[PDB]
Structures are given as structure tokens and as C-alpha cells.
A = this chain, B = another copy of it.
């Protein structure tokens, strides 16, 4: 007997993550759950075939059904075009999806009692609230061919005025230029959910910017946050014996490095992206981090793995070599989507399973069964022997059996 799951939007990806995603479905999802799954193949071949429409279609299904689970995808550059014989150098599916849905990507490492960190202090978790909208992820970058003038212009809707700003005057040779932006409502939602997360977890909140250099752009964030804090959350923080503090990114990164964790870190889009990878790695592995996009509507979520398609490990796989790619971040992408689905649908069993799987995952690693990366945390990469770890198939076989054991034990 399987659990009556509900409506889940599914997005298939590329390379190593594609191989893993199917193994998750085959072994951990479908033998226990019955879903009205809405699959979109966001692999580079089908994206190129549909002229990236499948990506737009996948984002719209998430709006409709409120739950989306995404597999890591290839964002094409010149090399990829040449590799896959692509029509165009397509935009990142994540950028496309995130700009349509909006909200905040909450990124948090998954801990195991036996997995040593690279950063000594981090005894308490760090949660990054990455602003999933605007900035460099909806930018307008172009190449300046030669001497000329680059200008950024603004024209209000009423046609009553116009502002022109000199970006630069290329007096000799060419170069590059780019325009980027953000909206107040998007920043406001970001602030709201950033403060809300701090209260639910009971931790101080930090907002990093470079407002000293970007006095207007970065200052708008600093102000919008502060205003909403003073006028809507200040008292509640004092109630919970926590605080909100804006800091320059410079200070912030150095502060976290020497901290002991236990704080919500509100991050501007780009900083969120880079810093979650620094954080993930500092705890242990890049394959050991949850990533959930919480939309401003309070009811829609998009869960994924923070890492990419693990191209390097996939090339070993193609060559027929031994592979040990971490599927935990991709497994939790499923458990987090299902956990929210259960919450939306008042589903006791689905919630139980979503959690059961997360516990199964951690327990297996805490039992000595892990991938190479996790073995490298224990013994150090140069000292890692073959017997120390399990391969991607071997590790999914252990998770599979342990999950069968756990659910059978649950039925009493």
C-alpha cells in the first residue's frame, strides 16, 4: 500500500543529477508514494528542442500546484553550445523560474554527528536567505565594441520627466557594460520572510550589503529592512531576546567565519549564491545542503539541491570509472517539497514519510555508510581508501533498504 501523495511538479535535469534523480524516484519515492506528478524534462536537449518553453511551462505548473521539485540543470556557455549543438546560449532555468515565482531561497547545511567540518566554530546552523530575484540574475550585459558612450536612462510612466546617467565614456578601445535592477515589493517580501525565519528559529538576523559603495541601490535594501523591522518586528525580537543588524558584506563574511553559527543570514541574490556554497563546504560537503525557494504568496515552494549537475563526476561515469556522487541534497529536494505538500493537504502519512526519509538519510551516514566526499571529511582526501566509502549505486542501495526497514517499523 502506497501514500496518496498529491500534486507535485517535477523538473528533470542533466548529467550526474539526472542519473541520481531517477534512482531516487525508482528506489525511494515511487515504492511508497502515489503522486499526480507533473513532469517537465528540463534537460539541455529538451530545452533546446522546445526553444526553452518547457522552463516557462514548468514555472507556471509550480504557480498552479504550489509544490515543485527541481533536478540540477546545465546553464549553457560557448562550450556547451559546441558540446550539444545548441540553437542558442539559453538562460539558466533557475534564473527563469526564480524570476517568475520570486521569493527567498533558504539554504541550510545537513549535519551528521560523525562528519567533521572544515570550519572549527560552526556548532550551530547558519541559514542563508538568498533573495531569489533581480540583480545579476535578470541583468542586461553587453560588449562595448569600441570608443563610445554608455548611458543608463530612466523615464517615468507619466512622461513628465527623464533622467540620464553617464555610465562611462570609452575614450580608447572597447570593453563591457551592464544594467541591472530590483523592485521594492520583491525586497519587501525578502525582508518580511527574512525576519519571519529569524523568529521561527529564534536566532539573530544579519543583512549584508555594500551600501558604502552602492549608496542608492544597496541603501534601498538597508532602509526597507530597517523600516519594516522598527515598524513591524522590533518588539517581537526583544520578546525572543534576538536582534536584527545590518553589516557590510566584508565584515559579515569575516564575522560568520569566526562565529559559532546560530543566525539567519539575509543575502542579496549574488551573495546568497556564492556564500551558500562557502557555508556548505565549510560544514563538510556541497552535496549536504537543503535549498528551498519560499514564494511571497506563503503557499508556493520550489525545493532543489544547491549544487550543480556534478559534470566532473559524470565524465568519469561516461569513461566507465567508479563514481561516488552525494545524492542527499537531491533527496532532501524531494523530502522538502513533499513536507510542504503534506502541510498544504493536511496529510499525516506524507509528512511522516518526508521526515522518515530525512532521518534515514542522516542515520545511514551516522552508521558509517557514505560517499567519498564524506569519507574525505573523516580521513582527509589523500588518505581515503576504496573500502572507506560506497559508490553512487551502492549508497542508494543502503538508503533504499533502510527506508524499507524504517517504514515497515512505523506500521507497528
Residues of A near any B CB (own CB < 8 A): 75-78, 89, 92, 95, 116-121, 134, 136-157, 163, 165-168, 170, 172-187, 210-220, 249-251, 253-254, 257-258, 270-271, 273-275, 277-278, 280-282, 286, 308, 376, 381
Contacts and interface: CB of A to CB of B under 8 A. Distances in A.
B145 A156 contact: yes
A267 to B, nearest CB: 11
Given A153-B153, A167-B152, A210-B136, A178 B217 contact: yes
Given A118-B258, A250-B274, A163 B146 contact: no
B257 A274 contact: no
Nearest to A160: B148
Contacts of A147: 156-157
B149 A154 contact: yes
Contacts of A271: 274
B281 A213 contact: no
B215 A77 contact: yes
Contacts of A139: 167, 213-214, 217
- Per DSSP, chain A at the interface is mixed
A181 B151 contact: no
Contacts of A92: 212-213
Contacts of A165: 140, 142, 179
Contact of A143 (B179, B216, B278): B216
Given A148-B154, A151-B152, A179-B177, A257 B273 contact: no
Given A138-B168, A139-B167, A257-B281, 20 more contacts: A75-B212, A95-B213, A136-B210, A136-B213, A142-B152, A143-B217, A146-B157, A147-B156, A149-B154, A152-B167, A153-B153, A170-B183, A175-B185, A177-B217, A178-B181, A178-B217, A180-B180, A250-B308, A254-B286, A258-B281
Contacts of A250: 273-274, 277, 308
Please indicate which of the listed interface residues A95, A136, A147, A274 has the most CB atoms of chain B within 10 Å of its own CB.
A274
Given A142-B165, A156-B145, A210-B136, A176 B77 contact: no
Contacts of A119: 118-120, 282
A46 B308 CA distance: 50
Contacts of A148: 154-157
Contacts of A118: 119-121, 257-258
A216 B141 contact: yes
Nearest to A373: B258
Which 4 residue pairs are nearest across A and B when measured between Cβ atoms? A152-B179, A141-B217, A167-B179, A254-B281
